Design a protein around this nucleic acid. Structure first.
Lengths: 52, 210, 105, 334, 49, 47
DNA sequence: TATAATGGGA
């Protein structure tokens, strides 16, 4: 409803960085080599980043 | 030992010898000295910024131009954190953010072959090294090994941030091209700060000879 | 960054900050009254891991012996720098000689 | 240069003599057996004593509670049982020095696996993991040098690492070995033919169970992905991904078409009774996303499978009638 | 000019193939490859401005 | 639908800039007239 | 799971 009139930039604390996060990426995997679906704890996991 | 009949008369580390039936103490302090960003984070956590302000103000009333120029620049940094509310230890990272996936996509193009973003392999190299550090701390590994993973960890984080800045840039196998870091995403001609200024292709447009 | 903000806040040169963050030198948070090379060690002092292990784990020097040769000292006997714990094997430091691997009993 | 830093660090630790190698491996096995006899005397788990001993050795800093209360119970034991505490401590010290003195061997083995997708230091650190597992179940009583057992473990941990981490899209282990077998054969026949093979001849070279279609599909997965940031042309203003269309995001025309379809179907269904429409919406999955069979819909409305089928059929030919007159839904039909 | 460049890269493809193998009897067939010179002329006719 | 085209409440170039800056551990605050936080992500990335 | 193998390479 309100209109953005200024933009501030500052340092991000760990707890603030975790406030942005929908989950911790725990694994280096991306997509399954066969199904091509995202892996469960990897960089494309829908359980944290959102549905495809 | 002996319930109080014998006591050590010097500082040092102990080691109980069962063959000689003796207890030796080597002259060794319990000193606190650290490496890595853990050490810097603690030093940043212990800084009393208000005292450093008074400490530097009284240094720039010194006649020498050189040292009151060093205290002048050093005060600009100190005044910044004070007037902003930024805690100086925040410059050391404990949690590293991860960009949303669709901004660093992975999709198959024509011919079935996949095409992905460099940021993924940078994150992937960071997750690999961070996970190896975890299961090395749990295995109780010696310090030479731990120091190596911590070096490679710092070298993995700042490659995600600004690949190439320090050290040789990380590249994919089969190429010399540096992987695009988060800084290259913002800085430069193709960066996000030049994107809106330089204009765009637009819908609802046409072209013809006149 | 071209003028380091961390190096400025703590009063560390880029060379000093490089050696700490990338595990070349320790830095003293609490000296605990340590001394080295005729001087104490203040807070915020940079020292190599050789100086760190000597100041924290102690100084020990091992001397191998030619085979079959016996030693002139006895087990757990205090030594003096310059003493002859074995013929031709001069003591380089004050301490306590400890036999490590005996071949004859 | 972090490689020169690490090689200098492992350089400070001198190599260990065969006597020291036997003595350290002895204290390790004695310490491990001292831990098991503490799990009988005190009654708690092996790994618990294992970590409490590791703590009190390699570092000072629940730390004040659980760690110190377990060590305190161990300190309050008889003399005959506190021997095994001291034996475990020095046994864990022996494990540390046994590892540190052979980090030099890990480098000598890991350097052969370079250029496979993992850097040198990643090749050293997964190898160091093999060195730890080699020490932990090394038994010196067999009278074999520690270098023989370690070398087998350094190579196991490096090969396993390359199989799990080098690929961007994770590939099973046997397929990686399979892809390596395929990749070695195409280079010697390139030298023999002076040219790259076709899929039939490389399949004839691979042996039985390999045909021209299998080598094409296994080589298909073997290739790493392209970078979207691959530069196009000498101009520094375009990447590969700048020219790739988004095949998954709907266009403005597609997004509107699905909304007009949902709107025009609602207007079509409004020409029916609410039960007629609700039956069709349940049968077609418009409610929850799954086609309900005649049984569930009849259970919803309290009627039979046949009564639902008549409602469904009557509702359809009413829609067909209105559709023959309005023609709103005739398109959307691809 | 770009021909002798692909030969100077075939030169390496000969020099380094000599430290290995059986240095007594090596045919120049398995000492020389078509890949260096082929990729040199193709870069010229397809990429040179 | 014969309607006047609406204005974007928060353009996409704004959204990408913030997330790419948040990726570098920089807190980018979008403030309005009185300096209070505006959430340019409406129930989309707010948790 | 065991001959032994112990400081890189452009």
């Amino acid at each position: 409803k309100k209109e953005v009139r200024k933009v501030r930039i500052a340092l991000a604390s760990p707890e603030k960085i975790r406030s942005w996060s929908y989950g911790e990426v725990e694994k280096p995997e991306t997509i399954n080599y066969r199904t091509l679906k995202p892996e469960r704890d990897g960089l494309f996991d829908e359980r944290i980043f959102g549905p495809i | 030992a002996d319930g109080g009949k014998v006591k050590s008369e010097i500082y040092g580390r102990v080691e109980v010898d069962l063959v000689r039936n003796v207890v030796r103490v080597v002259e060794s302090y319990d000193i606190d000295a650290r490496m890595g960003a853990e050490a810097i984070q603690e030093l940043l956590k212990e800084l009393d910024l208000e005292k450093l302000e008074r400490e530097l103000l009284e240094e720039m009333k010194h006649p020498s131009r050189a040292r009151r120029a060093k205290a002048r620049k050093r005060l600009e940094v100190v005044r910044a954190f004070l007037d902003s509310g930024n805690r100086p230890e925040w410059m050391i990272l404990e949690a590293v953010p991860v960009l949303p996936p669709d901004l660093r996509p992975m999709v198959q193009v024509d011919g079935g072959r996949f095409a992905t973003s460099d940021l993924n392999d940078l994150y992937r190299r960071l997750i690999n090294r961070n996970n190896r550090l975890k299961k090395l701390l749990a295995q109780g590994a010696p310090e030479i090994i731990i120091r190596n993973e911590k070096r490679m960890l710092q070298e993995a984080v700042d490659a995600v941030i600004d690949n190439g800045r320090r050290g040789s840039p990380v590249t994919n196998p089969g190429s010399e091209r540096p992987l695009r870091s988060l800084t290259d995403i913002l800085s430069g001609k193709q960066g996000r700060f030049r994107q809106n200024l330089l204009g765009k292709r637009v819908d609802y447009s046409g072209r013809s000879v006149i | 960054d071209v003028p380091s903000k961390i190096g400025t806040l703590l009063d560390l040169s880029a060379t000093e900050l490089e050696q700490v963050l990338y595990f070349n030198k320790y830095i003293v948070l609490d000296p605990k009254g340590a001394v080295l090379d005729g001087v104490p060690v203040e807070k915020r002092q940079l020292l190599t891991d050789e100086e760190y292990r000597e100041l924290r784990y102690g100084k020990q020097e091992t001397y191998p012996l030619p085979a079959g040769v016996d030693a002139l000292v006895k087990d757990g006997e205090e030594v003096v720098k310059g003493q002859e714990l074995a013929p031709g094997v001069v003591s380089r430091m004050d301490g306590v000689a400890l036999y490590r691997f005996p071949r004859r009993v | 240069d972090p490689v020169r830093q690490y090689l200098h660090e492992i350089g400070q630790v001198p190599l260990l003599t065969l006597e020291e190698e036997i003595d350290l491996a002895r204290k390790v096995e004695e310490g491990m057996e001292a831990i098991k006899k503490l799990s009988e005397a005190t009654g708690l788990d092996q790994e618990l004593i294992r970590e409490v001993v590791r703590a009190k050795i390699l570092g000072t800093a629940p730390d004040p509670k659980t760690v110190e209360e377990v060590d305190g119970k161990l300190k309050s034991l008889p003399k005959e049982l506190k021997r095994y505490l001291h034996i475990a401590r020095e046994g864990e010290a022996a494990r540390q020095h046994l590892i540190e003195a052979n980090l030099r061997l890990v480098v000598s083995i890991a350097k052969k696996y370079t250029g496979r997708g993992l850097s040198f230091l990643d090749l050293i650190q997964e190898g160091n993991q093999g060195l730890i597992r080699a020490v932990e179940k090394f038994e010196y009583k067999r009278r074999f040098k520690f270098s023989t057992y370690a070398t087998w473990w350094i190579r196991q941990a490096i090969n396993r690492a390359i199989a799990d981490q080098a690929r961007t899209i994770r590939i099973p282990v046997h397929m990686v070995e399979t892809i390596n077998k395929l990749s070695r054969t195409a280079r010697q026949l390139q030298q023999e033919l002076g040219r790259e093979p076709s899929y039939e001849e490389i399949a004839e070279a691979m042996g039985p169970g390999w045909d021209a279609k299998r080598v094409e599909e296994t080589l298909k997965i073997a290739q790493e992905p392209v970078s979207l940031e691959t530069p196009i042309g000498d101009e520094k203003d375009s990447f590969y991904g700048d020219f790739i269309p988004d095949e998954n995001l709907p266009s403005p025309v597609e997004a509107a078409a699905q909304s007009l379809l949902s709107e025009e179907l609602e207007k079509a269904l409004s020409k029916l009774s609410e039960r007629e429409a609700m039956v069709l919406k349940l049968r077609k999955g418009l409610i929850d996303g799954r086609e309900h069979t005649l049984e569930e819909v009849g259970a919803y409305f309290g009627v039979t499978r046949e009564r639902i089928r008549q409602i469904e059929n009557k509702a359809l030919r009413k829609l067909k009638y209105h559709e023959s007159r309005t023609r709103k839904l005739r398109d959307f039909l691809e | 000019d770009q021909f002798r460049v692909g030969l100077a890269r075939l030169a390496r493809g000969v020099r380094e193939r000599m430290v290995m193998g059986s240095p007594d009897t090596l045919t120049p067939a398995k000492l020389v490859n078509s890949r260096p010179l082929e990729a040199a002329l193709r870069e010229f006719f397809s990429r040179s401005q | 639908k014969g309607e006047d085209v609406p204005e974007p409440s928060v353009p996409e170039s704004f959204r990408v800039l913030v997330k790419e800056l948040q990726a570098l551990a920089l807190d980018v605050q979008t403030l309005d007239e009185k300096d209070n936080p505006v959430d340019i992500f409406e129930g989309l990335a707010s948790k």
